Amino acid sequence: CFPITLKFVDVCYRVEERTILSGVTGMISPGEFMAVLGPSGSGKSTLLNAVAGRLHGSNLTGKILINDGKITKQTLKRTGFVAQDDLLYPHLTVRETLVFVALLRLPRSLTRDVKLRAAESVISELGLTKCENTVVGNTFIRGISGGERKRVSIAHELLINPSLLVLDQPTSGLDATAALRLVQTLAGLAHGKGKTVVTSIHQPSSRVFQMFDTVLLLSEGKCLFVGKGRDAMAYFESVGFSPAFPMNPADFLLDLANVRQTLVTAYDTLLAPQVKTCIEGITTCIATWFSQLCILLHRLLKERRHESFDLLRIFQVVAASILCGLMWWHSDYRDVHDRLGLLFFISIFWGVLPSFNAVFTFPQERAIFTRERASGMYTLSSYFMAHVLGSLSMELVLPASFLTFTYWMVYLRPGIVPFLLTLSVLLLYVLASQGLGLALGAAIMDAKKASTIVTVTMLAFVLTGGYYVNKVPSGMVWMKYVSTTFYCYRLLVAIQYGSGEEILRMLGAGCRFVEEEVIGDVGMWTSVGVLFLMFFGYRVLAYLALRRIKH
C-alpha cells in the first residue's frame, strides 16, 4: 500500500472580516483514526476542506503537508472526500451508480465479474440490499430517503479504497445501530489496512467515542484538546474542570467548547510545545479510453431515456414543416424572389433552434461535473467525446424529418442528388450552430446569462446573413465572412439555382439582381471547408473552456 502522513501547522482562515479558524495544528499518521469535534459553527467543514485540498486562495495561511510535501494532483488522486451534500444522479439506481463507479476506477487487470462482485459485496455490507432496485431520485422526483443517500455516497468512495479518506459528518441522518455499524466498519478499515481516516462526527455516543483513536476539539476557531481519546477526561480534570455527575465524555467536550479564555490559555501554555516538537505502453491508454467512453455513453443514454425521449419535439417540428410547406405551396421556378426567402427562413430556423437548445447542456450538469472532476474519475476529453456522441443520436433526426416534408410539399428542384446535397449541407450547418451554442454555454457558467448572449449573437448572424440589407458600407462588409448563416445560405442557393448561367436564359436591372443574389464571390468548396473549420473550432473552444474550470 501507499502510506500517507498528514500535517497542518498554524492554519488560519480569514474571509466583513471574521476569523473562522486560527492556530490549529496537528498530524495524523497512517493507521490512525482522527476525529474533528466541536459545536455548530465552530469550524469543522473548513479545516477538512482545506485538508482535502478543495480550498485555495490567499485566505489560507499556515502550512499543510502530505508525506512532508506539498499537495499535488498525484497525491489528490489517492484522496477520497465525502461531503455533507449528496450530489447523485437522480435517474439512476443504486446498483447502476455503484457498478459504474466500480467499472470506472477499479484496476484494469481484472475481469468484469470480479468488479461486479466487489460492487455487490459493498452494497450488501452497507445494508443497501432492500432498496438496491429503486431510483435514487432528487428533491423533485420521488426516490430513496435521506438516510440511504448518505450510505450511497459512502459507498461511492469506499468502493475505490483510497489511501487517505476524509469524511464530513457521515453519521448524520442514521439511527444509532446503523451509525454504530458504519463507525465499526470505518474503524476496521482504518486499523486493518493501515490507512489514514479523518472524520468530523457531531453527535457521538460513548460506545462510538471509545473506539476513536485521536480527537481534536475546536471551539469557534480555537483548539482546545488534541491527542488520545481516553486522555481528554484526565487532561480536563487536571486542568481544573471535573464532571459533577457521570456522563458521556463528548457532551463534556462540547460543553467546554461551547471559561473559554482560561481553557485556551491553558492549552496554549501546556500542549503547544509538545505538539510543536513531536511534529518535526501506449495501447493501454487507447483501450482504457475506449472502455471509459463506452461506459460514459451507456450512462448518458440511460439518463436520456426518460428525458430525451419527447414526442413533443417531433410533433412540433412536423407541424412547423407542414406550415412552411403550405405557405409556399408549389411555387414555380420563375419567381426567384419568392423561393429565395424560403431558403433564408430555413437557415434562420435551423441556426436558431440548435444553437438555443445547445446552451443548456453543460450548465445543467455543472453541479455534479465539479464533484466528479475533483476526485479524478476520468479525463475531461472522454466526457466531451461522450457528450458530442450522445447528442448526435437525437439531434440529426429533426432536420431530416423537416426536409422530408418541406422539400416535397414546396416541390423544389427535383432530383435525388440535389436532395442529398441539400440535406448534407443543412446537417453540417446545424452541427456548426450546435457547436457554437455549446461553446457559448461552456464559456459562461450560468445557463441564463448565456441565453441572451446567444440570442443576440445569432440574431446578429441573421442580420449579417445578407438577405436583409443590400447597400452595405464598404468599410464594414467583412463581417459577412464570419456568420455561419452566410455560408449555409450561399450553399443552398448555389445547389438550388446552380451557377446562375441557367437563370439568365429564361430572363434573357434583373440581371444585376440575379448576379448579386446568385453568384456572389465565394465558392462551394470554400464554404464547405469553412463550415468544417467552424465546427472543429467551436468544439475546441468548448473543450478549452471546460479545461479552464478547476474549482
Ligand X SMILES: Nc1ncnc2c1ncn2[C@@H]1O[C@H](COP(=O)(O)OP(=O)(O)OP(=O)(O)O)[C@@H](O)[C@H]1O
Please give the annotated binding residues, written as ranges: 38-45
Does 59 participate in binding ligand X (rule CB under 6 A)? no
Query: Going by DSSP bridges, is the β-strand pair 79-82/164-167 parallel, antiparallel, or unpaired?
Result: parallel
Binding residue (CB under 8 A) for its own copies from 96, 132, 251, 372: 251
Q: Is 330 in the site for ligand X (CB under 6 A)?
A: no
CB of 8 to ligand X, least distance (A): 15
Q: Can you tell me the distance from the alpha carbon of 83 to that of 45, in angstroms, rounded to the nearest whole number?
A: 8
Interactions with its own copies, residue window 74-103 (CB under 8 A): 84-85
Piece in contact with ligand X (CB under 6 A), picked from 142-150, 240-248, 461-469, 504-512 = 142-150
Q: Which range, of 272-280, 282-290, 325-333, 543-551, touches its own copies by CB under 8 A?
A: 325-333
40 belongs to the binding site for ligand X (CB under 6 A): yes
Quick check: 203 binds Mg ion (CB under 5 A)?
Answer: no
Nearer to its own copies, 23 or 173 (CB): 173
CA gap 228, 225 in Å, rounded = 9
- Residue 41 is a binding residue for ligand X (CB under 6 A): yes
Report in angstroms how near the CB of residue 229 gets to Mg ion at its nearest.
21
Q: Binder to its own copies among 34, 174, 197, 403 (CB under 8 A)? A: 174
Under the criterion CB under 6 A, does residue 341 sit at the interface with ligand X?
A: no
In terms of CB distance, is 174 or 493 closer to ligand X?
Answer: 174
Query: What is the Cα gyration radius of the chain?
Result: 32
| Binds ligand X (CB under 6 A): choice among 145, 238, 265, 393 | 145
Cβ-based nearer residue to ligand X, 43 or 162: 43
Binding-site entries for ATP: 38-45
The piece of 32-40, 96-104, 486-494, 496-504 that touches its own copies (CB under 8 A) is 32-40
Binding flag, residue 134, ligand X (CB under 6 A): yes
Least Å distance between CB 178 and its own copies? Answer: 5
Q: Scan residues 148-187 and list those touching ligand X (CB under 6 A).
A: 148, 173
Alpha-carbon torsion angle 498, 502, 503, 508, nearest 10: 160
C-alpha distance from residue 347 to each of 271, 403, 522 (Å): 75, 12, 18
Burial of residue 430 (CB within 10 Å: 0-12, 13-18, 19+) is buried
Label residues 440-472 b or e (16+ Cβ within 10 Å = b). bbbbbeeeeebbeebeebbeebbebbbbeeeee
> C-alpha angle 519/522/527, rounded to 5°?
120
CA 341 to chain centre: 42
Give the total of residues touching ligand X (CB under 6 A). 20
Chain-centre distance for alpha carbon 47 = 24
What is d(CA 512, CA 518) in angstroms, rounded to the nearest whole number?
Answer: 10
AA letter at 519: I
- Name which of residues 185 to 204 contact ligand X (CB under 6 A): 202
Phi, psi of 81 (to 5 degrees): -125, 130
- The piece of 37-45, 278-286, 290-298, 407-415 that touches ligand X (CB under 6 A) is 37-45
Please say which residue, 38 or 465, places its beta carbon nearer to ligand X.
Answer: 38
Question: What is d(CA 250, CA 228) in angstroms, rounded to the nearest whole number?
Answer: 13
Cα separation, 513 vs 336, in Å, equals: 10
Does 45 interact with Mg ion (rule: CB under 5 A)?
Answer: yes
Contacts of 550 (CB under 8 A, 6+ apart): 373
CB-wise, 37 or 348, nearer to ligand X?
A: 37
Query: Would you list the DSSP string of 447-472?
Result: TTHHHHHHHHHHHHHHHHTSSS-SS-
Write out the binding residues for its own copies, residues 124-153 only, by CB under 8 A: 130-131, 133, 139, 145-148
CB of 178 to Mg ion, least distance (A): 14
Name which of its own copies, Mg ion, ligand X, none residue 424 binds, using a CB cut-off of 5 to 8 Å depending on partner kind.
Answer: none
CB of 92: closest distance to its own copies in angstroms? 17
Nearest to 387 by CA among 413, 366, 414, 418: 366
- The window from 37-45, 222-230, 232-240, 382-390 that contacts Mg ion (CB under 5 A) reads 37-45
- CB-wise, 460 or 540, nearer to its own copies? 460
CB of 144 to ligand X, least distance (A): 4
Q: Which is nearer to its own copies, 258 or 424 (CB)?
A: 258
Structural contact between residues 404 and 322, judged by C-beta atoms closer than 8 angstroms: no
Task: Report how far apart, in Å, the C-alpha atoms of 202 and of each of 52, 81, 155, 167, 421 are.
Answer: 19, 17, 21, 12, 67
C-alpha to C-alpha distance for 189 and 526, rounded to whole angstroms: 63
Q: Does 316 bind its own copies (CB under 8 A)?
A: yes
Residue in 124, 125, 146, 193 binding ligand X, rule: CB under 6 A: 146
Nearer to ligand X, 32 or 148 (CB): 148
Give the count of alpha carbons within 13 A of 406, CB side only. 24
Q: How far apart are CA 413 and CA 201, in angstroms?
A: 74
Instruction: Identify whether the C-beta of residue 196 lies closer than 8 Å to the C-beta of residue 4.
Output: yes
Binding of residue 60 to ligand X (CB under 6 A): no
Q: Which is nearer to ligand X, 57 or 415 (CB)?
A: 57
Q: By C-beta, is 45 or 265 nearer to Mg ion?
A: 45
- Within 6-25, the residues that bind ligand X by CB under 6 A are 15, 18, 20
Q: Which is nearer to ligand X, 137 or 437 (CB)?
A: 137
CB of residue 172 vs ligand X: minimum separation in angstroms? 8
Cell numbers standing for residue 75: 497525491
How many residues touch its own copies under the rule CB under 8 A: the total is 80
Distance of closest approach, residue 546 Cβ to its own copies, in angstroms: 18
Q: Where are the alpha helices (DSSP H) in 216-361?
A: 231-239, 249-257, 260-278, 283-304, 311-327, 336-358
What residues line the site for Mg ion (CB under 5 A)? 45
What residues line the site for ligand X (CB under 6 A)? 15, 18, 20, 40-46, 131, 134, 142, 144-148, 173, 202
